[PDB]
Design a protein around this ligand. Structure first.
Ligand SMILES: [Zn+2]
Ligand SMILES: [Zn+2]
Ligand SMILES: [Zn+2]
Lengths: 150, 127
């Protein structure tokens, strides 16, 4: 089983560890871990194109989008590969992450190893705001490069 | 990937940015950049197996060797700055000798034994 990990860091209190596991190349990727230092509530959660943290999260580029699709939520047909929706933080600022996604991969062209995972200031509206390429999730609070793990 | 980048950071003052470019699949990889905060002299320069920085550099695993990850030493001047310009044909940005998603580490001592891991970062896709 392929495994990966990402340590999210930023300029403030937001920090976390997110694990990834994929049992077969054609199968879903389990994403799990926690992010601390967040405001209680929803926070956008995305894989961005570049594993470039030379300017913090600012250099990560846009949402990872190898298929040139429109932004959406994870269960939407039309979505960026990197659209993992939202995570939810408790009253202590801790967001427990437990996602299973069949669009991201740890191999092939949907490959997220070496790219950047980012958690945002606000909720990602998933393109269902009722009135986007980002989901209006606000600033990039913390991020890290996704690496190969044991 | 044709280009990769790595931001090195640790618990102390060692910091830097290292670029990797491999314009041709399976071709030589150019590695360049600068690292500051080092003691004057030689410092081991290695790719470690895991891009796992959950425990800082201590979780990066062993030297990558499916040594494939051994990039020799970098040399810091009197100001603590090491300018890096290396060509390596064993590492790669694809394939079995894939270093994307692994950890680059600069060590306390020379890699003639290299001592502590002063700074490290996960190698990310840049282009
Ligand atoms: Zn984002
Ligand atoms: Zn998106
Ligand atoms: Zn080493």
């Amino acid at each position: 089983a392929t495994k990966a990990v990402c340590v999210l860091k930023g300029d403030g209190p937001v920090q976390g560890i997110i694990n990834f596991e994929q049992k077969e190349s054609n199968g879903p990727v389990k994403v799990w871990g926690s992010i601390k230092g967040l405001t209680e509530g929803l926070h956008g959660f995305h894989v961005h194109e570049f594993g470039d943290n030379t300017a913090g999260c600012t250099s990560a580029g846009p949402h990872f989008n190898p298929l040139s699709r429109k932004h959406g939520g994870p269960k939407d047909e039309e979505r960026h590969v990197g659209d993992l929706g939202n995570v939810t933080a408790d009253k202590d600022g801790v967001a427990d992450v437990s996602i299973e996604d069949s669009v991201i991969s740890l191999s092939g062209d949907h490959c997220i190893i070496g790219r950047t995972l980012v958690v945002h200031e606000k909720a990602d509206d998933l393109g269902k705001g009722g009135n986007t390429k980002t989901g209006n999730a606000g600033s990039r609070l913390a991020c890290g490069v996704i690496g190969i793990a044991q």
